[PDB]
Design a protein around this ligand. Sequence first.
Ligand SMILES: *[C@@H]1O[C@H](CO)[C@@H](O[C@@H]2O[C@H](CO)[C@@H](O[C@@H]3O[C@H](CO[C@H]4O[C@H](CO)[C@@H](O)[C@H](O)[C@@H]4O)[C@@H](O)[C@H](O)[C@@H]3O[C@@H]3OC[C@@H](O)[C@H](O)[C@H]3O)[C@H](O)[C@H]2NC(C)=O)[C@H](O)[C@H]1NC(C)=O
Length: 196
Amino acid sequence: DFEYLQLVLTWPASFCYANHCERIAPNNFTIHGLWPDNVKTRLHNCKPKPTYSYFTGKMLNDLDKHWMQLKFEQDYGRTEQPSWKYQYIKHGSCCQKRYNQNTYFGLALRLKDKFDLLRTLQTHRIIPGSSYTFQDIFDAIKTVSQENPDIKCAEVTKGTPELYEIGICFTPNADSMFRCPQSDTCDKTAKVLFRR
Ligand SMILES: *[C@@H]1O[C@H](CO)[C@@H](O[C@@H]2O[C@H](CO)[C@@H](O[C@@H]3O[C@H](CO[C@H]4O[C@H](CO)[C@@H](O)[C@H](O)[C@@H]4O)[C@@H](O)[C@H](O)[C@@H]3O[C@@H]3OC[C@@H](O)[C@H](O)[C@H]3O)[C@H](O)[C@H]2NC(C)=O)[C@H](O)[C@H]1NC(C)=O
């Protein structure tokens, strides 16, 4: 049994600045993944590999919005579901005792719905278009994560760290909060850009 679940939320504006996007970047956080993990070594590609079934209807519409596959065209994304499949096989495979394909993705949607990080940041006077200290961002998120969240940065331009993703950890059963390991990817010697 793994130690915790990490909900990874992507900030679209940043993701589409550091990567090639085929979808318009939503002005809200989206799901990048839900990773069962351990503090020691990274857990991934657990056996046996779980068969992936293509989603349809409501679940499909829900995932296309909340877990938008930014790197692919909408039609291909909805039809072939490349990113959802990859994430399920690489990470979903590590929590098959408590979840199935449907409840794994359902959980991701439920956990995402628990937060409105954009609004939380705003009430802490942190909005897109400016830069802020790592600590200020961290403190704002912890007000809702309860336990330590993981603020992940990317540097599209050397020397300009920016908010790329936010991780929030939960217990394996997703009933309680858990302290996320700190990736220390943000250069705290300088402010962090919150891309508009
Ligand atoms: C940016 O993204 C965030 C997260 O997705 C958006 O916030 C969420 O927005 C949805 C849609 O407006 C909103 O859904 C509504 O939820 C309430 C109940 O919410 C409470 O209970 C949830 C379960 O216990 C819990 O997860 C929440 O955190 C709240 O405590 C329902 O009563 C409403 O009916 C509505 O639910 C939606 O109904 C339509 C259905 O198709 C859909 O699946 C279902 O979700 C969330 O509450 C809200 N979450 C938060 C934390 O506020 C945010 O709005 C986005 N930004 C903008 C500007 O759009």
